[PDB]
Structures are given as structure tokens and as C-alpha cells.
Amino acid sequence: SGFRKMAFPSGKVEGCMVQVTCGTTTLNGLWLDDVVYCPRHVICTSEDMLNPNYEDLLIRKSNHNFLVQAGNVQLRVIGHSMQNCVLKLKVDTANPKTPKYKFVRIQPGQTFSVLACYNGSPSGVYQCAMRPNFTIKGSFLNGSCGSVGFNIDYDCVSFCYMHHMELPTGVHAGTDLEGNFYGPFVDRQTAQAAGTDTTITVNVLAWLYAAVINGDRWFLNRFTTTLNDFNLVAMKYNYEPLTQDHVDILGPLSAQTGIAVLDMCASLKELLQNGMNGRTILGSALLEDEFTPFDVVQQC
Amino acid sequence: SGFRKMAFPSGKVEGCMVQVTCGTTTLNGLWLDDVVYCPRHVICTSEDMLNPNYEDLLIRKSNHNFLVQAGNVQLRVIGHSMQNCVLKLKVDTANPKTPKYKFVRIQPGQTFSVLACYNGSPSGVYQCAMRPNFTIKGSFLNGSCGSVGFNIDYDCVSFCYMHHMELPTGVHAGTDLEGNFYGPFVDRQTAQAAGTDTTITVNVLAWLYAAVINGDRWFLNRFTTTLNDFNLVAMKYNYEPLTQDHVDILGPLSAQTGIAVLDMCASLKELLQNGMNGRTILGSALLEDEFTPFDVVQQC
């Protein structure tokens, strides 16, 4: 019993974290086999970040200008290449601690664990979601760039996020491990405004299912609804539209609890209309959207 | 920027988790050097847990009745002893992955990271606090007993919690690593009622300091208070009494923000009296008490 924001055990990723220094920028890199992956902005000065020509800046750099440190031990960089917004630094030593891994590009609303690092060293772990506007609400200070987000599925680490930027609003942007940004964001210190941060409706429903599992039932009402009638409500509360694909994904939690998905949708509509009246649900005073259906099943 | 419930990296503890089976109870043990620590209720059947005589039950057990598995590899138990509510199983092999460690008995209101395990295998990590009634609000299913709570301080793992029990109310009880329960709880399946779950006032203040650091300032008022006047308020809201030791611990966060501790106390009094009016603070609709002053400084 009980229900926590639960991250994957971080040990497999800790063994992959290194320090990358270029000139006088230090950040974190990910060492898998004989490649170190890091944000390409490692090559930029402060002034460069205002308006960087990455191809031009990369002309000035050779293999020996990339200082890679794994603990207290120096890796020899034997090649480098830019792939979208990441650098790949070929090193002469394969990481002996390399886990089984893949690179995956997640969808908006998918969750992951972050291992926030500074100077190549693990600081801490927490859960995140890919917001529908393609930002995350991380905890990242100066030096945390190159910290990664991941899921562990079947003892295989699926890397989904590398940290690049903090927006002026203090939310976070980054790439997949092919170096493609999530959303419209660029690795430039310029005005970048996030769009509407909508609520991940399918996740809220999963968490309501989690609450019923755990004995928090007060919010279950006597109504049902339709996907269209629900969605007219969802849209006025900046909730994402629910699809029949969402309903299908909730089926196992429906089966477990005996609560039809549309019934749970009607309960959520009443919570949106009437609020929570100073009550809580799984110890939250608001509707939590950073648990996926799969996250709930895994935890329960 | 941003502020998360942040756990320590779990890798150092993952390397210590083993499976312990006695008869047909399986749970988790902690392998440090040549000792495995686990809950003594490993020796109990279901029926035994109603009213166990641990000394008598232990008469029936020899070293070979304790099956200890580290991954896919069997440890030889060469001695065993009961220390309060834990068993210590001496094994013939020192754990090669043993970190620098200590055993510490924390105070009520102190926080820690939990690595929830099943069958000796890491499942996930989250933060907890030792409630003032000496329960924790974990996430623990059947098989999770022996999962540990810890802090990492200076690359030394300080073990503070081993999981033993779920109360009928679905909160959790356990021991330190000397096997002494936190609070009045016993390793018996009997009616055990927790006392009043009060709020950890010093922690709330730390989190208000965290919010100011991160730019969430709306709740700062124009008042001050006194420790006595504050505490008359705290007591009616089942908040723990604030002491001058608490004020002293908040000094660094006071210094950073320029907000005198008693001023922040007055802000909290208004939040207790008037509530939050549907607003949030560091994305919580309620006052969060599971960050210590030290936790905030570490994260910021």
C-alpha cells in the first residue's frame, strides 16, 4: 500500500556518467561503449551562446580539445562528430560498465527518471514528464547539462532525454540521444516561449485508478459520461483530448478496479468542475498527471 | 531552477541487496562486508506472525535454513544471531561492492531515500520522511520487507531504516540497522494504531525558503511573529513546536534569501489561517514537509 513518485534505480546510469570539458565549459557526458554523448554547446563560450554557428565553432576544435574524465581517470578522444544538437566523442576505451541500452524518442505525456549530475558526478534522482508543450519541469542548476532521462524496461536502459537548456520561465528543454530537441526549442540563448502547458488527461486517470487501488475512493461519483462530453470539459480546463487509444491503455486498471473508464472520466469531470473542497487524493491537493498507466501498473 | 522530491543515486545500495529465504518466507537483506541484515520475521509463517516467540522460533533454525542469494549466486551462511528485531547472517564472502557506510538512528522529521526491492532485486527509489509519530508513508507491497532507507553524505552511505511492517491504516513501520523499531511498533500482526501525524514545521519553512529561491514569492506577507505566538498557531494546526534549534538550522536559508526566520514564520501562520486560495507553491497545492533544511541547501 501507499503510492510514491518512484524513479528507476539509478546505478546502471551512474556507471555511464563522465565529465566533458571543452575550453572552459564543463558539463556531463554519457559513456556507452566507446562513445561519449554530450550537448554540442560544450564548445560555446557565454558570448557564443547568444548566436552560435556550431559548424564554424567546431572547425576550431580537435580531438585533444575535448577533456573527458571518468571519475579520476582520463579518456583518450580518438574522434568526434556532431549529430543534430549532440556531440559524439569516440574514445579508445569501451565503458566496462555499459548496460544493455537503447535510444528512444518519447511522446508528450511519457514519464522518465532523471539522474541530475554535476562535473560528471551523480547528484540525485527524480521523476519527470515530457509536457505536452515539450518542456520538462526538472531540477537543474549550472553544470547539469548532459544529465539524462531514462526508463528501465526488462533490464535494458532506454535513454530518452539529455538536458540542454533552461528557458527564462525556468522550465527545461533538451534532446533525445540522437540530439533532436523535443519541441521547437534551439540550443541558443534567445527568447523561447513555451506554449500552453496542458494537463495529461490519461495520466490523471491512471492516478485516479492508483488512488482507488490504495483505498482513496471519496471522489467516485454516481455519473458516467461520453468521450465527446468529457472532452468538451477537458478542453475548457486545458486538459489534453482523451482518445480511444487512451481508453484502451487504461483497460487493465479498469479491469482490476471494476471501474469503467467512462465512469472514471465522469468522476474527473466533477473534480474539474467542483475542485477538491480542501480534501486530498493520494496525499495531493491537486490532480497529478506525471504517472502513466504503465507507471501505475508497475508500482501496484 | 525548479525543485523536485530528489532521492540519492541508488547504485551504492543496489550492490548491497540480496534475497533471503527461510522456510517459505522470502524477503530482502542488506549485504555489507560478511554480514547480511534482514528482518527477523523472515523465520515466521503467516500463523507465527499473530503471536511470534522469536527466541523459540529461532531454536528450530540452523545456518543452512537461511538461503541467501546475490543475483544468481548463493552465499554460504556460516553463523546467525538476532539483534533486537534484525537477524545478522554471517556469510563466508565479504560483499565486493560494499560502500563506505554507517548505521544511524534518525530523529522524527528527518528524510531519507528508500530503495524498494522484491526478491532481492531493486524496484525503485523515492523520498520518505520519519513522521513525528514514527511511521513512514512508503510504497511497499508484499515481498518488500528488508528494503532500506538511507542518506549519502560525503560518499558514505548512512543506513537509517529497514522496512518490517504495514499497519492496518497502510502506513509503514520499521527499524534502524541495529533492529530497534522507530516508535512503539512491534514485529507482530496485531492492532497497532499510530498517534497523531503532525506536520514537521521546520521542514515546511525550509520548503518556503526553497520556493523563494526558485521565484515563488506570492505568499510573503508584511507581518512578523514570535516563536511563542507562532507556536500557539502551530499547535492548533497539529504542527510540531518550533524551537530555537530549528531557527538556528534555518539560518543559512535566512541568510541567502534575506528573509528573517520569524518573518517566514508569519507567512506560514497566514497560510495556515487563510489556506492557499487555489494557488500553488513549487507546484504543490499543500504545504510540503518532507524537505529538511539540509535537503533544500543540497538541492539549491
Ligand code: NA
Ligand atoms: Na499537492
